[PDB]
Amino acid sequence: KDRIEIFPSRMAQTIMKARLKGAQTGRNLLKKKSDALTLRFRQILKK
Amino acid sequence: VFGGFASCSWEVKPQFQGDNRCFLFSICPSMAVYTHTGYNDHYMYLNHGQQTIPNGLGMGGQHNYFGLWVDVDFGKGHSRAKPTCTTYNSPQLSAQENFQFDKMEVWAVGDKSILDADPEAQALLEISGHSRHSEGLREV
Amino acid sequence: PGGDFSDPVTSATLGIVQVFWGLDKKLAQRKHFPSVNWLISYSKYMRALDEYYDKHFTEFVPLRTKAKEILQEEEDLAEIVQLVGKASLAETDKITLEVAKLIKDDFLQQNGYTPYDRFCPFYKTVGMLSNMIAFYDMARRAVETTAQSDNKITWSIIREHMGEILYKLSSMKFKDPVKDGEAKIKADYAQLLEDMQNAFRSLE
Amino acid sequence: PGGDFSDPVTSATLGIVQVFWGLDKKLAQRKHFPSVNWLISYSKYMRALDEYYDKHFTEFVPLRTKAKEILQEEEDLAEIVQLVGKASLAETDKITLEVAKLIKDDFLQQNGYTPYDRFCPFYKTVGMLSNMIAFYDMARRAVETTAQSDNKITWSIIREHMGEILYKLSSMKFKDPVKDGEAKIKADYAQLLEDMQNAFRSLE
Amino acid sequence: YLSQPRLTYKTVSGVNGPLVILDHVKFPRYAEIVHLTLPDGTKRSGQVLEVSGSKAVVQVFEGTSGIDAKKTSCEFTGDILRTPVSEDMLGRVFNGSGKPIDRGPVVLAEDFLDIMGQPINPQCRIYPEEMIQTGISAIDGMNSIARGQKIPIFSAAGLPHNEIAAQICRQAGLVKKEENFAIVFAAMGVNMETARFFKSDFEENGSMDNVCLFLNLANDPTIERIITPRLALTTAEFLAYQCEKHVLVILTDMSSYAEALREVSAAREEVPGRRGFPGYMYTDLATIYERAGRVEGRNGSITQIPILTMPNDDITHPIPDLTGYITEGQIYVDRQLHNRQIYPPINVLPSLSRLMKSAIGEGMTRKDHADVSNQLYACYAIGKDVQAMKAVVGEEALTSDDLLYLEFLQKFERNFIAQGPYENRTVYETLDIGWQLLRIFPKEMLKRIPQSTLSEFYPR
Amino acid sequence: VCLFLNLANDPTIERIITPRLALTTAEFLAYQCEKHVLVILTDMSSYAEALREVSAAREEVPGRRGFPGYMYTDLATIYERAGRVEGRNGSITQIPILTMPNDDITHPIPDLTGYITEGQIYVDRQLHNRQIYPPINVLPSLSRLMKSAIGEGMTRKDHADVSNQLYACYAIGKDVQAMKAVVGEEALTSDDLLYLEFLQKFERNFIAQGPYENRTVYETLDIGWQLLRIFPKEMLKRIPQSTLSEFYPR
Amino acid sequence: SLQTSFVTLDEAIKITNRRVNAIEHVIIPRIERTLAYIITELDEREREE
């Protein structure tokens, strides 16, 4: 639960830097997709 | 050749469903029809992947003692109405106690997938490290 | 050293020994003892003890395959409850989350420096394992028989009416195998079965 | 060791060579064959070849500038096309996902044992892109001048109406460059252009 | 011949771990076997690791306890390590050094071959163009082995990769549609429970008359494990390239070979490369593996199945990363299939054999082999996606076509992958098991299978 | 009190002999003077950085994180000079003090100390920022001599059962708190708004003390049962029936 | 029609959030802590070499 099983090497450093970076791009969608849905959600309460 | 008729729709539920118009018949050994006797209302049955009650299609009798049963391991079943049946007064339909079949027909009388359902879960599955196992193997 | 299981004394031992059980990854610094670690734990004498098991205990090996099936299915589901959160769980799987919580806290976890658990005889282990796998079969019928129509017995309804019985399943480890008898412990395990069987006849 | 630019052999080759025909393993199970990536693959012989293309072929550099761009605007759409899914989208983007799809199955698609795709002559190679870029710019000029006036259209009124145009634009890769004549292939791509200039004048 | 008598030096000038150096040695060879005599009367054996002028160091195999600088005589044979090789050693059991441990005689040699061998001419090597059937459905149905291939079985510590190997040793054979087929089983660094199992399995089933067994235990010295896979291949390179048989070599626990090659090289104070293993390990694994394949002119072939253990299930370890650089596939014994009690627990999704196209088809097995295999691989790939997605999204999102890829997935893991360790299926009854599993789907849904073979084999 | 002070500008290789000069006084005052001794060895991290220093320029084979090979038996030279002996009425109780660098319990100084000493007391940074004194994380803390030093006839009947239950409620409600960060405050059952109730009352009424409270061993337990009345009787699954029938209802 | 588009956007927001928080507090910290162990254990393999 505390580490993803891989062993320390130079290649396995770039893959867990890409998977972290490939997760921060997913959260950046979902951080603003929720607020874009919250942008319509206030207007229904403003209706 | 044997089988049965269902009076209402089939619906996947543990309870015994159906009413008194459901009957069993026979064709190729002999031609006879067995209507209901009303001793019990254990008419139809349909269960789809549980572990404490049987999984398959069944008509007549009770649990594990059906008068006609088709199992989930397809191409198998039984008609264990050894003296006769209880709901239908119907005999052992097959030649053996537990038959095996290759042809089945279901005829009505009168009148996307889970892989493409959630686009956020396929986004969360790829983020959590779990792969896809199949690109270029399925259609769209 | 350091709670990491890729140290060169473990992976050198894995290629030598025949039985091996190791503590968990999460439960190494915090004491939850014993744990299992299914990624390296094994015993290659599981096939070499089946002539003994059917002779003297004769119903333990059907219990062990289900007791390994509840635990190997909760490790699948614990990653998804940490990600979804009990929402994509039909009620037949919310039981397997909870008998595996009941086995890893009461059956597997053994306080070896108490006088009532420093030695657990093998009838008491099977007696403790019989009463939980009987409970898992009586719970998972109480959900699956009332499922699609109303009176949907969930796992939630099972906890409110049988709150005193799941403590008594957690009370099966407090039996002392010397102060109590051998057929006194077995005379108090079957009464838990006859109250477990009478606790689902009130539900159906 | 599994497709990276972290090892000292792959990263110290790309500091020396000029062409990188960059291939990946993810883009291989599409049965695409080659496994071309066209995002990390480059060629730095575009400035040296600005004299061969402008003298002998005199048309190709602006089509090559556009065709690398249409396959790039598809990428920054395709993450939202997966997550959101084509629901509230502009109609100039639906061109650069359907014309862009026409490139990725009829221009960058190969199969090496076939009697049409073991040799691709270059005059037929620029002959296929001479029609595909013209269909892109005429779909763009249609959707931008008919965006405000009267009877505004989308893409889904064209591809149903011009389904027989999208068959001739998809049967360019299946014309055999080996049996057919040298000038038997350019006239077919010059007769098709008047089935692409007249066809848009059947909708407006 | 060798007529000159051998010098028995007593000039031991230093002991350092397993190494003994000498002095006043007259013209010492490289890798020349010496025969030490201890003071208490016992004998050992060694090998010369470095000469320098009149001084040679000696790597003693069996240990170094008792070797003093006064009374131990080293007798220099003047010859490299050559092993006695015969055709009637099919049916014997030798240890890691060539000594027989089946209570039998020492082998009467036909010709003393050298255990380093010779490199095979690439101008005299032929592509593997038939099949070794192995009895296991997941290795013959979907990952078919060509005669002359090198396909490692990757595994982990605790998985049944010994019972798999012993099942392959009993059920290997041609794809008959047998006097020139033989197994050479080498076990390096096994514990005592495994090498009694390998000995009590090949007499209990009568499959001994074609198997040579080179056992090498963990309590045995670490240098015998180095020279064990060069005895098993020199026996194999004799049986196929001189006696014209089809040999299958099984090298159980090749990860313990790389644990000994690290132990020998650390004794010589040499430089370590990636993760402690020597620099020369890529050319030392390929010294073993590349003694395989069919040749031109002879009518024999050598197939190799090495067997590894990935430490902590990390495929990126240098023993699997470098054996996937020289060989031609994987098998991937999986843990998640073992924990649900399936035998053999073979993960067909990461397993591959790069030479499957030249082992199947008309004349080899049957003309439907290449299309059943990659269709079962597609309905097992989709089935592993459905159950991965139905746990995260919920149970009520499954349509009726979607449950069908789970009826396959359960019946694939019970009728195709589940075998039982004494059930020997030929290839004609792996595909007839595989064809009644493809009839779970209707005809319109099998899109990986062509129509010209769907209209011959599918309807029953 | 007998103070051996090696300050920060005092020379480094005196720190090799400073815990040896202090413990030899202790083993004199306990085994020859029959006194009870409490030995306080603060910043044992500054022992090993002055031992790594002397082995660097000596150029031995370095071990884990550059610390020398013989670091286990060297801290075992120091920590093992403790305990009682037969026929002498004195004792040495040892409390060294460490600093884990970057709060890593898997550094070679707390991981090799935890293999020699009998339990450890963990001081964590997260409870320090939340103004808790003392900030003691009981989840990785341990006393390997607690099991035979408590019980009936030493402290009280229910000591060993309360601490095993106060462990399991803090260890569970720290997992529900990490489940509250995913599914939010709303999707929590009513027997899991009890485990978050415990953590607000465990680390303020039991852990958080104030530097001048002399809380007895009975006053600690009587705090520990009013935290175990947070739950109903049928969830204290680590406490048997013989002790729950007497100590729970008050 | 306005109170029936409320309870569709009231359920779709309360799932996305449990999925932004399931990355912020579960997935991304686990990928960061294995990064802080690769830069540590490879400092060790440079030091022994």
The full DSSP string for E358-400 is TT-STTTS-TTHHHHHHHHHHHHHHHHHHHHHHHHH-STT--T
Q: Kindly state the DSSP code that residue C189 receives in the 8-state scheme.
A: H
Interface of F with C in 41-100 (CB under 8 A): 64
For residue F75, count CB atoms less than 10 angstroms from its CB and return exposed for 0-12, middle for 13-18, buried for 19 or more. Answer: buried
In sequence order, the β-bridge partners of residue E252 are E187, E307
F230 touches F202 (CB < 8 A)? no
- Give contacts of D 65-104 with B, CB under 8 A: 82-85
Q: Do chains B and F touch (3 or more CB pairs under 8 A)?
A: no
CA dihedral D151, D156, D158, D163 (to 10 degrees): -160
Which residues are paired to E301 by β-bridges?
E246
Smallest CA–CA distance, residue C83 to chain G, in Å, is 6
Round to whole Å and give the CA distance between C30 and C37.
Answer: 15
CA-CA distance, C21 to C13, in Å (whole number)?
11
The Cα–Cα gap between G1 and E247 comes to 77
Would you call E346 helix, strand, or coil by DSSP?
strand
Q: Are D98 and D159 in contact (CB under 8 A)?
A: yes
Which residues of B fall within a CB distance of 8 Å from G19? 120, 124
Give dist(CA C87, CA C100) in Å, integer: 19
Residue F89 and residue F34 in contact, taking contact as beta carbons nearer than 8 Å: yes
Q: Are D185 and D175 in contact (CB under 8 A)?
A: yes
- What is the length of chain A? 47
Closest CA to B58 of B30, B87, B101: B87
Q: B95 to chain C, minimum CA–CA distance in Å?
A: 32
Is C167 in contact with F139 (Cβ distance < 8 A)? Answer: no
Query: How is D156-199 classified by DSSP, letter by letter?
Result: GGTTTTTTTHHHHTTSSTTS-TTTS-SSTTTTHHHHTTHHHHTT
CA E213 to CA E76: how far, in whole Å?
30
Axis-axis angle for helices F71-79, F45-56 (nearest 10): 140
Task: Name the residue among C83, C137, C148 with its Cβ closest to that of B13.
Answer: C148
Question: What is the Cα–Cα distance from D53 to E41, expressed in whole angstroms?
Answer: 88
Other CB atoms within 10 A of residue E427 CB:
23
Within 10 Å of residue E156's Cβ, how many Cβ atoms? 22
- The length of chain E in residues reads 460
Residue pair C126/C184 in contact (Cβ under 8 Å)? The answer is no
> Strand E211-217 relative to strand E181-190: parallel, antiparallel, unpaired?
parallel
- Which of G11, G19, G30 should one mutate to test binding to chain B, selecting the residue with the greatest count of B CBs within 10 A? G19
* Yes or no, beta carbons of C140 and B12 under 8 Å apart: no
**CA dist., res. F127 & res. F125, Å (int):** 6
Q: Of E226, E217, E224, which Cα lies nearest the Cα of E62?
A: E224
Is A11's Cβ below 8 Å from some Cβ in G? no
| Beta strand segments in chain C, E | 19-20, 42-43
> Which of the other chains make 3 or more beta carbon contacts under 8 angstroms with chain G?
A, B, C, F
What is the least distance, in Å, from the CA of F162 to any CA of chain G?
A: 32
- Whether residue B15 lies within 8 A of chain C, CB to CB, comes out as yes
Q: Strand E93-94 to strand E211-217: parallel, antiparallel, or no bridges (unpaired)?
A: parallel
Touch between chain F and chain E (3+ CB pairs, < 8 Å)?
no
Could you tell me which of E295, B123, D27, E66 has the C-alpha nearest to residue A33? B123
Residue D150, amino acid: D
Tell me which residue of E414, F1, G18 sits closest to B121, measured CA to CA: G18
G5/F106 Cα distance (integer angstroms): 53
Q: Tokens 């286990």 identify what position?
A: F72
d(CA E61, CA E48): 11
Nearest to F139 by CA among F96, F115, F162, F169: F169
For residues B50 and B52, give the distance between their C-alpha atoms in angstroms, rounded to a whole number: 6
Best mutation target, E197, E200, E217, E339, to test chain C (most C CBs within 10 A): E339
Comparing CB atoms, the residue among B102, B114, B137 nearest residue E393 is: B114
- Using the CB atoms, write b or e for E374-399: b if 16+ within 10 Å: ebbbbbbbbbbbbebbbbbbbeebbe
Best interface-test mutation with D: which of A6, A10, A13, A19 has the largest number of D CBs within 10 A? A10
Sign, CA dihedral F189-F191-F195-F200, equals positive
For residues E287 and E261, is the Cβ–Cβ distance under 8 A? Answer: no
Burial (CB < 10 A; 0-12, 13-18, 19+), residue B67, is buried
F181 Cβ under 8 Å from any chain G Cβ: yes
CA distance F76 to F114: 11
3-state secondary structure of E19: strand
Chains with 3 or more CB pairs under 8 A to chain D: A, B
At E368, the amino acid letter reads D
CA distance B60 to B43: 5
Tell whether residue F65 is among the known ligand binding residues. Answer: no
Bridge partners of residue B25, in order along the sequence: B3, B33
The answer to whether D117 and D178 have CB atoms below 8 angstroms apart is no
Give A47 to chain E, closest Cα distance, Å: 33
Place of tokens 């206030």: A42
C85–F189: do the CB atoms touch at under 8 Å?
A: no
Minimum distance, in Å, between the CA of residue F48 and any CA atom of chain G: 18
**CA–CA gap between residue C23 and residue C37 (Å, rounded):** 6
**Distance between CA atoms of residues C12 and E256, nearest Å:** 10
Q: Which residues of E touch C14 (CB under 8 A)?
A: 157-158, 309, 311
Q: Which phi and psi angles does C74 have, rounded to 5°? A: -75, -30
DSSP letter assigned to residue F140: S
Q: Among positive and negative, which fits the CA dihedral E380, E385, E388, E391?
A: negative
Q: Which of F172, F171, F163, F238 is nearest to C117 (CA)?
A: F238
Per CB-CB distance under 8 Å, the chain B contacts of D26 are 135
B50 touches chain C (CB under 8 A): yes
Query: Which residues of C are less than 8 Å from G27 in CB distance?
Result: 83
Angle at F183 between CA F177 and CA F185, to 5 degrees: 65
Q: What angle (nearest 5°) sits at the alpha carbon of residue E47, between those of residues E43 and E53?
A: 120
Which of A5, A7, A10, A14 to probe by mutation at the E interface, max E CB count within 10 Å? Answer: A7
Q: Are C97 and C74 in contact (CB under 8 A)?
A: yes
- Using the structure block, give the residue that is written with the tokens 């699954």: F237
Residue F225: in which H helix or E strand, if any?
helix F217-226
Across the interface, of D29, D30, D85, the residue whose CB is closest to B119 is: D85
> In C, which residues are within 8 Å of B13 by CB distance?
147-149
CB of B12 within 8 Å of a chain E CB? The answer is no
**Cα separation values, E428 from E50, E248, E365, E368, E424, Å:** 56, 21, 7, 11, 12
**What is the DSSP code string of E400-414?**
TTTTHHHHHHHHHHH
Q: How far is A11 from chain D (nearest CA, A)?
A: 6
